[PDB]
Ligand binder design. Structure first.
Ligand code: K
Ligand code: MG
Ligand code: MG
Ligand code: MG
Ligand code: MG
Ligand code: MG
Ligand code: MG
Ligand code: MG
Ligand code: MG
Lengths: 155, 46, 161, 86, 108, 45
RNA sequence: AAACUCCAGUUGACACAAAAUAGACUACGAAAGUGGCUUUAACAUAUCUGAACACACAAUAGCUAAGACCCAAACUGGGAUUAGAUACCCCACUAUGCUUAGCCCUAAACCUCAACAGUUAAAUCAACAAAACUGCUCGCCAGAACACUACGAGCCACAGCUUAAAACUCAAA
C-alpha cells in the first residue's frame, strides 16, 4: 500500500524511532512491515506538498500478542495518549478513578514493567505482558473493558 | 526649621491619654476631600 | 551588626538642639521609623569614619569600595529571603565583580589603604584563577588519581630511603 | 453584580420616542468602545496579532490626520485664476 | 514612614463605632505607631456591595488614620484588620503628603 | 538500534578511561592501583 | 444533526483562573520579558573593550514529583457532510496553559544594525534595506553541496543541546 511518508514511517518505526506511535505497534504485532521506498510529491501530476511511501505487509505466522484486537487497541492507545510522559501515566487511565492507583500498581507489578519506561521505548513483549494482565483483570471484572475516563470526567 | 515644625506638631498627636477625647471629637466632626475643576483651571470647592 | 534603631538619621544628627527634643520627635527622626536606605547610609558613614582618612571625600577609591560593600551587603540580605530573585542575584554578582576590580586597583595603587579597607570591611582578597576551563567528571577523576598516585610514590620512596 | 442597577448604560425615553432612546444608547455604547469590545471578545485574539492591529490602527490614524492636514493647508490655494492668460 | 489608613467600618451606632476606633488605634500603637490624627469622612452608601465576615454591607463609615509606623508594622497591622469583624475594608497607603509635588513647565 | 551502538560506545569510552588511568600508575611504578582507588563509572547514569 | 432537560430566565451567595476603559501613552528591564490594587525589599560600576566552553540568566513548547481546575485546548470519541465528504462546521473531554520545588537551554531569541568614542566635511552613494563615514577593540567569515551532517568531546539532556569535518561530485552557487 501507499501511505503518506510520515504515516509509512510510523507504521515502520522500530522501538526507539521518533515515528514510534500507536500505528507502529498496532501494525507490527500482527505483520512484518517494510517501508521500501518513498516517492516525492513532485511526481504526482497535481503536485501535493507531501511525499508518499510504499509499505509492504506480510502477516506474521505467530502474532506477538495472543489477545483480542480491541483490547490491544485500547491498551496501546492509552499507553500512547501521553507519548512523552512515563508509561504508567497512560496505563492509569484504563481504570476507574477509585481503583486507579491500586490497579495501575497491580498491573505494573504483575506485568513486570518498569514505571519509568516511556511509551516510545516499549517493545511488543512489554505490550504482550500488559495485555495479558489487563485481560485477566477484565475477566475478573466484567465492566472494566467498557470504561472511558472522559465520560467519567463529564459527570 | 523642619525639626522645629515637627516639635510644634507633636503637641497635637493622639496619645493613649487623649484617645477617648480625640475619638469622640472625630465622631463629632466631618472633613471633605472633594473638589471640582473647571475648564478654566479653577478649583470649585463644595 | 546594624545600627541600633534609636540611632538618628544622618540628615538630623547635626541639627542644633536635637538632644533637647521630645522622645516622640527622637523616634520620628530615628532609624526605627525609616526605610532600610537610611540605615544603609548610616552604615556607610560609620565605615567611612572608621576607615578612610578623609570621611568627606566620596570620590576616592576607598569611599566607592565602602559604598559598594554596603550595597553588596544589602543585596545579600535581600537574597537571603528572596531566593528566586534572579535580577538581584545578577546585581549581587556584578557588584562583587566591580568591587573586586576596585580592590585590584587599590592594591596596585595604595597598599596601606588597601589593607585598611580589607581589615575594616572584612574582605579577603583572592587572586583570579589563571585558566578558565570546565572541570568535567573525567578531568576531576584523573586529577584525583594523579594526586593519589603521587602520594603513594612519595610513601614508597620514603620507605626505600 | 455588586453595583446598583438602572444607573449604568441606562437611557430614559422622551415622549415615548423609544427609537431615539435606543439609537442614543447604541451611540453611547459605540463611542465608549463597548460594542467593539463585545465584538472582539467573541474569539480570542492572539497577543502578537493584537499588538500588530493596534500598531496598524495607530499609524493609520496618524497618516490619515497628516494627509488631511496637508490637503486642508493646500486647499487655500484652490480658487479662481488671478493671472489668467499669462 | 508616614502612612494613611483608609478604614470602611460597619454602619453601627456611635458607641460601637467609638469602641472600634479605639481598638484600631490601640492595635496601631501596640505595633509601634505614633498616630497623628483621626479624621471622619462620614457615613455613606458604599460604591458597591461588600461582603465581609459573612455579612453583606451597602453602607459604611469612612475614616482616615494618619500615623507614623516602622516598615515592619504595616504587614502586621494588615493582618489585624483582616480579623476585626467590624471593619468592612481597611487599606494602608503611603501618606499622599509625603509624595513630592514636582513642578511642571507645561506641555512641550 | 541507535541506543545499542551508543551504549556500546559508552562502554568503550569507559574502558579507555580506565585503561589510561591504569597506564598512569603502571608508569609511576605502582604494581596495583592506590589503596582504596576504584575507577568510577562516569559515562553511565 | 447530535448534546443537555439534576434544562433555561430574574435574583442572591460564590476562584490557586486572567487582569475592560486608561493605552491615540511608548515607559521599566542586560535580554527574555513587563500593562488589576496596597505595602516591604529593590533596579552594579566616577575610563572603554573584554569568553560557544568561566560565572549567572534566558519567550513558547516539553519532562519529574505534589496540588488547583472557570475557561481554552494538541490528541481521543460522537454529530453533519461528497461520491474517496470539511483536516476546516457542531458537541463532549484529555496532556497542556495555573501554583510550589527541580530539570530541559531552543526561537523570524530581529532594529535581521557587535560594544565604546567621534564627524557631517567631503566624491553622498554598486542595488535594496535603515543618510555616509572615521578611530579603537572583541567575535566571526574565505565557492556550492555533502552538512543545523558523521566522528571526537562535553552536558540532570540518552533521539536531545553545543562545537563541528573529510571522501566523491560540479562550474557554478
Ligand atoms: K523582527
Ligand atoms: Mg565590560
Ligand atoms: Mg573564543
Ligand atoms: Mg527557557
Ligand atoms: Mg510549562
Ligand atoms: Mg485539564
Ligand atoms: Mg499550551
Ligand atoms: Mg561584544
Ligand atoms: Mg547533531
Amino acid at each position: 500500500l501507499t501511505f503518506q511518508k510520515e504515516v509509512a514511517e510510523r507504521l515502520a518505526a522500530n522501538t526507539g524511532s521518533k515515528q514510534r506511535s500507536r500505528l507502529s505497534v498496532m501494525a507490527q504485532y500482527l505483520c512484518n512491515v517494510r517501508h521500501i521506498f518513498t516517492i516525492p510529491g513532485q511526481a504526482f501530476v497535481p503536485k501535493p506538498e507531501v511525499d508518499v511511501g510504499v509499505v509492504h505487509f506480510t502477516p506474521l505466522i505467530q502474532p506477538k500478542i495472543e489477545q483480542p484486537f480491541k483490547l490491544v487497541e485500547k491498551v496501546v492507545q492509552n499507553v500512547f495518549q501521553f507519548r512523552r510522559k512515563y508509561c504508567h501515566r497512560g496505563l492509569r487511565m484504563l481504570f476507574p478513578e477509585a481503583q486507579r492507583l491500586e490497579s495501575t500498581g497491580r498491573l505494573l507489578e504483575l506485568a513486570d514493567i518498569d514505571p519509568t519506561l516511556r511509551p516510545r521505548q516499549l517493545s511488543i513483549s512489554h505490550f504482550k505482558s500488559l495485555c495479558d494482565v489487563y485481560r485477566k483483570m477484565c475477566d475478573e471484572d466484567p465492566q472494566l473493558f467498557a470504561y472511558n475516563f472522559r465520560e467519567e470526567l463529564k459527570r | 526649621r523642619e525639626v522645629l515644625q515637627l516639635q510644634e506638631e507633636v503637641k497635637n498627636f493622639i496619645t493613649r491619654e487623649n484617645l477617648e477625647a480625640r475619638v469622640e471629637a472625630a465622631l463629632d466632626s466631618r472633613k471633605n476631600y472633594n473638589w471640582a475643576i473647571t475648564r478654566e483651571g479653577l478649583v470649585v470647592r463644595p | 551588626d546594624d545600627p541600633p534603631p534609636s540611632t538618628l538619621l544622618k540628615d538630623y544628627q547635626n541639627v542644633p538642639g536635637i538632644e533637647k527634643v521630645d522622645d516622640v520627635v527622637k523616634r520620628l527622626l530615628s532609624l526605627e521609623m525609616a526605610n532600610k536606605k537610611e540605615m544603609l547610609k548610616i552604615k556607610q558613614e560609620q565605615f567611612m569614619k572608621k576607615i578612610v582618612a578623609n570621611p568627606e571625600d566620596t570620590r576616592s577609591l576607598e569611599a566607592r569600595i565602602i559604598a559598594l560593600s554596603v550595597k553588596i551587603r544589602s543585596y545579600e540580605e535581600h537574597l537571603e529571603k528572596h531566593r528566586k530573585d534572579k535580577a538581584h542575584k545578577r546585581y549581587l554578582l556584578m557588584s562583587i565583580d566591580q568591587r573586586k576590580k576596585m580592590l585590584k586597583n587599590l592594591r596596585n595603587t595604595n597598599y596601606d589603604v588597601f589593607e585598611k579597607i580589607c581589615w575594616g570591611l572584612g574582605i579577603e582578597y583572592t587572586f583570579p584563577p589563571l585558566y578558565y576551563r570546565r572541570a568535567h567528571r573525567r578531568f576531576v577523576t584523573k586529577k584525583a588519581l594523579c594526586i593519589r598516585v603521587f602520594q603513594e610514590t612519595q610513601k614508597l620512596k620514603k620507605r626505600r630511603r | 453584580a455588586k453595583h446598583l442597577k438602572f444607573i449604568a448604560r441606562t437611557v430614559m425615553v422622551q415622549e415615548g420616542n423609544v427609537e431615539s432612546a435606543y439609537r442614543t444608547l447604541n451611540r453611547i455604547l459605540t463611542m465608549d468602545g463597548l460594542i467593539e469590545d463585545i465584538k472582539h471578545r467573541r474569539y480570542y485574539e492572539k497577543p502578537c496579532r493584537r499588538r500588530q492591529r493596534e500598531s496598524y490602527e495607530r499609524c493609520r490614524r496618524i497618516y490619515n490626520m497628516e494627509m488631511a492636514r496637508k490637503i486642508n493647508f493646500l486647499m487655500r490655494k484652490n480658487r479662481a485664476d488671478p493671472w489668467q492668460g499669462c | 514612614p508616614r502612612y494613611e489608613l483608609a478604614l470602611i467600618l460597619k454602619a453601627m451606632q456611635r458607641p460601637e463605632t467609638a469602641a472600634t476606633l479605639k481598638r484600631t488605634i490601640e492595635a496601631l500603637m501596640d505595633r509601634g505607631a505614633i498616630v497623628r490624627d483621626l479624621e471622619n469622612l462620614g457615613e455613606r452608601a458604599l460604591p458597591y456591595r461588600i461582603s465581609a465576615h459573612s455579612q453583606q454591607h451597602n453602607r459604611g463609615g469612612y475614616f482616615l488614620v494618619d500615623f507614623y509606623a516602622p516598615t515592619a508594622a504595616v504587614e502586621s497591622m494588615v493582618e489585624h484588620l483582616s480579623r476585626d469583624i467590624d471593619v468592612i475594608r481597611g487599606n494602608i497607603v503611603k501618606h499622599p503628603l509625603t509624595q513630592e509635588l514636582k513642578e511642571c513647565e507645561g506641555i512641550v | 538500534l541507535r541506543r545499542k551502538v551508543q551504549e556500546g560506545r559508552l562502554r568503550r569510552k569507559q574502558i579507555k578511561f580506565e585503561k589510561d588511568l591504569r597506564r598512569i600508575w603502571l608508569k609511576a611504578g605502582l604494581k596495583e592501583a592506590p589503596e582504596g582507588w576504584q575507577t568510577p563509572k562516569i559515562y553511565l547514569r
